[PDB]
Each structure stands twice: as C-alpha cells, then as structure tokens.
Amino acid sequence: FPATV
Amino acid sequence: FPATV
Amino acid sequence: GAMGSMERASLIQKAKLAEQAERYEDMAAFMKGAVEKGEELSCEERNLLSVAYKNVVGGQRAAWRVLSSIEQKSNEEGSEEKGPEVREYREKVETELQGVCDTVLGLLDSHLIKEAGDAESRVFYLKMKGDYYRYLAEVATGDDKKRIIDSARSAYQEAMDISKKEMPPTNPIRLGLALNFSVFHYEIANSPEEAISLAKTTFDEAMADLHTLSEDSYKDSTLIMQLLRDNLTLWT
Amino acid sequence: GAMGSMERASLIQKAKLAEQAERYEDMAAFMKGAVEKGEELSCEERNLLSVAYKNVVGGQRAAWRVLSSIEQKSNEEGSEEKGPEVREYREKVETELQGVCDTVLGLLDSHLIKEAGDAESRVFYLKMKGDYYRYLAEVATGDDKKRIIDSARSAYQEAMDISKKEMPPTNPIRLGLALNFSVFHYEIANSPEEAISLAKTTFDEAMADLHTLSEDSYKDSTLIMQLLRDNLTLWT
Numbered sequence: 001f002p003a004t005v
Numbered sequence: 006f007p008a009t010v
Numbered sequence: 011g012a013m014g015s016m017e018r019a020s021l022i023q024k025a026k027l028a029e030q031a032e033r034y035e036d037m038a039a040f041m042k043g044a045v046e047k048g049e050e051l052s053c054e055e056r057n058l059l060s061v062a063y064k065n066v067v068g069g070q071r072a073a074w075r076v077l078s079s080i081e082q083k084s085n086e087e088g089s090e091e092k093g094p095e096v097r098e099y100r101e102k103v104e105t106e107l108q109g110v111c112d113t114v115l116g117l118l119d120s121h122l123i124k125e126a127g128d129a130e131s132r133v134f135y136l137k138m139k140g141d142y143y144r145y146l147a148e149v150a151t152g153d154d155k156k157r158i159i160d161s162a163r164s165a166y167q168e169a170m171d172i173s174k175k176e177m178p179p180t181n182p183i184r185l186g187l188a189l190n191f192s193v194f195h196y197e198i199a200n201s202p203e204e205a206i207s208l209a210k211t212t213f214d215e216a217m218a219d220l221h222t223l224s225e226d227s228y229k230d231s232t233l234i235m236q237l238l239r240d241n242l243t244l245w246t
Numbered sequence: 247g248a249m250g251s252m253e254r255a256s257l258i259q260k261a262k263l264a265e266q267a268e269r270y271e272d273m274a275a276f277m278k279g280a281v282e283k284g285e286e287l288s289c290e291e292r293n294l295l296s297v298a299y300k301n302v303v304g305g306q307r308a309a310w311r312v313l314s315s316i317e318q319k320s321n322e323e324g325s326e327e328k329g330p331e332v333r334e335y336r337e338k339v340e341t342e343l344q345g346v347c348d349t350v351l352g353l354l355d356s357h358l359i360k361e362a363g364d365a366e367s368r369v370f371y372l373k374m375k376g377d378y379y380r381y382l383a384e385v386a387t388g389d390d391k392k393r394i395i396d397s398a399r400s401a402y403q404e405a406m407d408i409s410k411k412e413m414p415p416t417n418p419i420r421l422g423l424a425l426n427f428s429v430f431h432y433e434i435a436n437s438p439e440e441a442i443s444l445a446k447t448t449f450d451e452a453m454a455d456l457h458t459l460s461e462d463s464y465k466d467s468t469l470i471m472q473l474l475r476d477n478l479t480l481w482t
C-alpha cells in the first residue's frame with residue numbers, strides 16, 4: 001500500500 | 006520479561 | 011458522552027498516557043471527549059486527535075483487507091462453500107469501521123471545521139475529512155459510492171486551495187495533504203496520472219523552498235517529501 | 247451472551263478468521279460464545295481459546311506496565327504533581343484486565359475444568375487457571391493478594407501433579423506448564439531458586455526423552471525447551 005500520513 | 010506460553 | 015464528567019485537561023493528559031501505552035481506542039475516546047467540550051483545539055491537540063483515530067481506523071482497514079481477501083477467494087470458481095460466516099464477519103468489521111469514520115466526520119462537522127479560521131487548523135481538518143471519506147470509499151459498494159468519493163474529493167480540494175494560498179510549499183500539513191490526495195487519486199478515483207502529477211509537482215516545489223528552512227523544519231519537510239518519492243517509485 | 251444466537255461451528259470459524267485479521271478481542275468473544283454452548287472443547291478449540299485471551303490480556307499487561315512505570319516516577323521525590331490522572335487511568339486499565347481474567351476464570355470454573363477428564367485437556371485448563379490468577383497477582387495489592395497467589399499456585403500444582411503422572415516429559419503442554427509455573431515462582435512467589443530448579447529439571451528430563459519422538463514432535467518439544475533455557479540464561 002502507498003504511504004499516507 | 007521471561008518467556009511464558 | 012461518557013467523558014462528559016471529565017475535565018478537558020484530564021482528557022488530554024489521559025490521551026497522551028494512552029498513546030504511551032499504545033491504547034489507541036482509549037486515546038481516541040479521550041480526544042473525542044476533549045473535542046466535545048466545545049473549545050477549539052491547539053496544534054498538539056489536533057495531532058493527538060488525528061493520531062488516535064488514524065491508528066484505530068488503520069487497524070480496522072488492515073483487518074478488513076484480510077477478510078475481504080479471504081472472502082474473494084471463497085468466491086473463486088472451485089472454492090468449497092464456507093457458508094455466510096466470512097461475509098458476515100467482514101460486514102461486522104466494515105460496519106465498525108464505518109462507525110469510526112462517521113464519528114470522526116461528525117466531530118469535524120460539529121463543529122471543528124466551522125470554527126477553524128487559521129490555515130494550519132482548517133487545512134488539517136479538511137484533510138482529515140477527505141481521509142475519512144476516503145476510508146469510507148475503500149469499503150463502499152452501494153448507491154452512495156460516487157457521492158462518498160466526491161465528498162472526499164471536495165474536502166481535499168478545499169484543503170488544497172487554502173494550502174496553496176496560505177502555506178509555503180514545504181509546510182508539512184500542505185505536504186501531507188498532497189501525499190494523501192495523491193493516494194486518493196491513485197487508489198480511489200482511478201486517476202493514476204493525476205496522482206503522479208500531484209506527487210511530483212508537490213515534491214519539486216518543496217525542494218525549491220527547502221533553502222528557507224531551519225534544520226528542524228528541514229527534517230520535518232524532507233520526511234514527508236521522502237514519502238512522496240516512495241509513492242512515485244511505487245507507481246512508475 | 248451476545249453470541250447465544252450464533253452456531254457453535256460459526257463461532258469457531260469466526261474465531262479463526264479473527265485470528266487471521268489479528269482481531270483478538272473479537273477472537274476471544276467468539277471463543278467465549280463457543281465455550282458457553284456447553285460442549286467440551288477439542289484440542290484445536292482449546293488452543294483457539296487460549297491464544298485469544300492470551301493476546302488480549304498480554305496487551306493489557308503491557309499497557310498496565312507502562313502506566314505503572316509512569317505512576318511510580320510521578321511518585322518519586324522531586325516529581326511535579328500530575329494530579330490523579332495517571333493513577334486513575336492505570337486503575338482503569340487494571341480493572342479491565344481484572345475483568346478479562348475473571349471472565350476466563352469463570353469459563354474454566356463453569357464448566358470446562360469439571361468436565362475435563364483427559365490429561366491433555368485437564369492439565370491445559372488448570373495451567374490456564376494458574377496463568378490468569380498469576381495475571382491477577384501481578385496487579386494485586388489488597389487483603390486478597392496472598393489468596394490470589396495461592397490460587398495460582400494451587401492450580402499450577404494440580405496441573406503439575408497430573409502432568410507428571412500422565413504425560414511424557416517432552417509433552418509440550420507439560421513443558422509449557424512447567425515454563426509458566428517456573429515464571430510464577432520467580433516473579434510472583436519470590437522463589438527464584440524454585441524457579442531455576444524447576445526449569446532445569448524440566449529441561450533435563452525432556453532432553454532425555456527426545457529420542458522417542460518423531461521429527462515433528464521433536465520440533466514442538468525443543469521449541470519450548472529453548473524457552474526454558476532462555477529463562478535460565480536470564481536468571482543465572
């Protein structure tokens with residue numbers, strides 16, 4: 001999964 | 006801490 | 011509210027303790043109680059709120075993905091009928107996830123966003139609103155799915171418009187918003203080109219503004235810039 | 247019981263799904279529902295029950311230790327008064343932990359132990375009974391603390407007596423019981439010499455019986471034997 005913050 | 010199962 | 015009788019400051023203190031104990035459900039409950047006191051949140055308090063619910067919903071999302079994967083395999087041609095249990099339990103986790111998202115969205119709507127006038131608070135809350143509609147979109151399949159997606163898009167877009175007018179390109183809130191809106195484009199809106207363009211432009215504009223920063227601000231900004239690069243590497 | 251309307255087999259299936267999703271609170275609730283159907287548990291089902299509650303209470307214990315550590319520091323000479331919040335929140339987690347322990351002990355008392363006649367079931371349940379009284383002992387400070395300790399000791403002792411009569415020295419249940427009873431001696435009963443003697447004798451008697459085992463049984467037994475050695479290395 002891609003990075004989110 | 007010591008190991009327990 | 012079961013936290014109605016506890017002091018605001020005690021709720022914030024206990025949220026911090028819950029964080030140290032990795033008790034994020036408690037942390038979220040404490041921060042919900044603090045929001046419901048009706049006062050605006052400071053920067054630290056906004057981040058306590060976000061950290062708590064991000065951890066709670068993050069765990070729910072991970073569980074949902076495991077269960078959805080098992081469910082899809084149970085439905086492949088050749089599988090042995092497992093009965094309704096996998097679907098039922100996926101639905102149970104899904105409903106709990108939707109409940110948490112609705113709770114957070116409710117706090118933002120009553121009344122965090124409407125009282126947020128400074129860019130750092132308003133962009134932060136509108137980013138959250140986009141994030142929690144995005145999590146609803148990840149599990150949505152019904153008559154409302156397009157509307158959920160558009161609610162995420164609209165919140166992210168308002169946050170983007172404010173951030174470009176009011177914050178420097180290295181502002182970590184602006185960067186994190188762009189990171190997440192880019193993921194929205196890639197994973198939710200079936201717009202990988204928009205996702206890639208947004209990540210690259212955000213990265214390049216930040217790069218050119220790093221020279222204005224202190225060492226500590228540089229560390230904060232480059233951390234998120236590396237996440238943008240990580241996603242770009244994943245997608246190209 | 248909120249699980250009263252669900253099929254026993256569906257509860258067991260959903261416990262396994264909850265495990266795959268690392269949803270151990272759900273797993274424990276499902277297995278509590280299965281126990282409350284009133285039928286004896288198979289070997290696999292006993293381990294599902296134990297895994298679920300061990301993970302739940304393990305997290306509570308970790309959180310309690312963090313909070314107790316913060317609380318002790320707040321009470322050192324020179325600390326700034328933090329108010330009642332650290333104690334209150336430690337007490338909250340403590341009460342939830344005690345509740346989980348009481349729930350498990352209740353399942354063992356109503357009526358898992360009394361229907362358990364085979365050594366592999368009866369020793370397993372009496373070990374659990376010692377374990378959950380041990381967790382109660384870890385947080386106990388009142389008029390009942392010695393009695394809680396003695397309840398753990400008595401359960402472990404009955405389990406030990408059965409295991410030495412009815413199981414080989416390499417039986418993994420016998421080994422795990424001895425591992426945990428040894429930790430009880432060291433950490434709860436202030437009997438480190440007993441803890442060390444029990445671990446060493448258990449290890450040596452198991453070593454001498456490994457020659458009787460298949461490759462798969464050997465792997466199971468040596469795994470727990472290594473935990474005995476690990477503790478001995480910690481303690482000497």
Ligand SMILES: N=C(N)c1cc(-c2cccc(NC(=O)C3(Oc4ccc(Cl)cc4)CCCC3)c2)cs1
Pocket residue numbers: 005029053054057058061134137182183184185186187233234
């Ligand atoms: N956890 C607590 N007790 C507290 C945390 C904070 C705090 C205050 C300012 C910034 C951050 N930054 C962050 O957490 C990360 O970066 C962003 C960036 C953008 C956005 Cl919008 C969200 C996170 C999250 C991933 C790495 C850092 C944390 C105060 S108190």
Ligand SMILES: N=C(N)c1cc(-c2cccc(NC(=O)C3(Oc4ccc(Cl)cc4)CCCC3)c2)cs1
Pocket residue numbers: 010265289290293294297370373418419420421422423469470
């Ligand atoms: N998790 C599940 N779905 C299932 C697990 C099982 C299962 C059945 C037999 C043995 C084990 N062994 C264990 O888990 C470990 O060893 C012991 C040993 C002694 C005791 Cl008394 C308790 C654990 C725990 C630490 C390492 C292995 C697991 C069936 S289903």
